[PDB]
């Protein structure tokens, strides 16, 4: 997250860190005690058996007893097309069930087919690049929905008046709009915080019935 701010500790208990060799590489969202959702490109050509799903984290540079670590049991995608950047969404089943508490909670999803209009105010977040290196503390950022320079197959956002936006390592992280998870960070154009192109998110509302068919 470029030009964002440190989140309050455990403000977004549904926020997840996906790690490889102990290092954060993508975000995800807890959508049931035994399922997280992230971006399909986060597991494309990865050895899923080594992916550690970390729940209840805040500062990735500190030892945190609030954390709950799971492994990935199964992968569920729905027409992910890397060539055309479509349906960048994956549901990862966990090898167990999370203990729901103050620091680990399930996210709420929108109704199937709910489209957001221009100007809707959202909150983006993640442990990706700051512009400075990877963030230690979870970062959040106020963003606004735009339908220009964006496809019907994405939810796009922009920061009005400043050089800020999502960056590398924020992929898979949620976009929260009116309390619901409406986006999964997918890609940026013209580099991070360009002020030319909006950041692109997988449109979660287009997949709700399918997510629900899996997580029940």
């Amino acid at each position: 997250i470029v030009g964002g701010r440190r989140a309050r500790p455990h403000a977004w208990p549904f926020m997840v860190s996906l790690q490889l060799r102990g290092g954060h590489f993508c975000g995800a969202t807890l959508i049931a005690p035994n399922f997280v959702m992230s971006a399909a490109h986060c597991v494309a050509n990865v050895n899923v058996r080594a992916v550690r799903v970390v729940l209840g984290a805040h500062n990735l540079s500190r030892r945190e007893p609030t954390r709950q670590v799971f492994a990935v049991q199964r992968i569920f995608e729905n027409g992910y097309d890397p060539v055309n950047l479509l349906n960048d969404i994956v549901i990862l089943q966990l090898n167990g069930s999370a203990t729901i508490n103050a620091n680990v909670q399930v996210a709420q999803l929108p109704a199937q087919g709910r489209r957001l209009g221009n100007g809707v105010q959202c909150l983006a977040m993640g442990w990706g690049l700051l512009g400075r290196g990877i963030a230690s503390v979870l970062q959040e950022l106020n963003v606004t929905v735009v339908t220009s320079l964006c496809r019907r197959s994405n939810v796009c956002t922009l920061v009005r008046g400043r050089q800020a936006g999502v960056c590398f390592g924020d992929s898979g992280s949620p976009l929260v709009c009116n309390g619901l998870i409406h986006g999964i960070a997918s890609f940026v154009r013209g580099g991070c915080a360009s002020g030319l192109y909006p950041d692109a998110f997988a449109p979660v509302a287009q997949f709700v019935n399918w997510i629900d068919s899996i997580i029940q």
Partner: nanobody, 123 residues
Framework: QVQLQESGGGLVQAGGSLRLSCVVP????????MGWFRQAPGKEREFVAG????????DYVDSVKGRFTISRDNAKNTVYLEMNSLKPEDTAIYYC????????????????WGQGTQVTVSS
């Protein structure tokens, strides 16, 4: 849409030099990692070299360190592979690669691959 068109292959004499290029046609998606893999016939794909989106970090295979240099040009969304002191064991189809994941440059988890170009080092 997302494409990797390479150029700069061909023949060279042992000890020679060659420069390869790879463009990501259009400002369609900013890819964190860009690099080069290579494959000799009937052998496995080999990471050769890689680079950050910023250019602050690079990595190479130990068999090409000091001889090969990888550079990037975000303005022309290109990557280049300067190959010097070429050995016949460097003969392979060189593939330009790209990927969005924030992972080590040497991690063989690249999603985007070019068609490859033939580099043939003589003897």
């Amino acid at each position: 849409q997302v494409q990797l068109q390479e150029s700069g292959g061909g023949l060279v004499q042992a000890g020679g030099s060659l420069r390869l290029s790879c463009v990501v046609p259009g400002r369609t998606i900013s890819l964190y990692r860009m690099g080069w893999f290579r494959q000799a016939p009937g052998k496995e794909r080999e990471f050769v070299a890689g680079i950050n989106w910023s250019g602050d970090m690079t990595d190479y295979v130990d068999s090409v360190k000091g001889r090969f240099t990888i550079s990037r040009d975000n303005a022309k969304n290109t990557v280049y592979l300067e190959m010097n002191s070429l050995k016949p064991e460097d003969t392979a189809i060189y593939y330009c690669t790209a990927d969005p994941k924030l992972l080590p440059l040497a991690d063989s988890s690249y999603g985007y691959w070019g068609q490859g170009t033939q580099v043939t080092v003589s003897s």
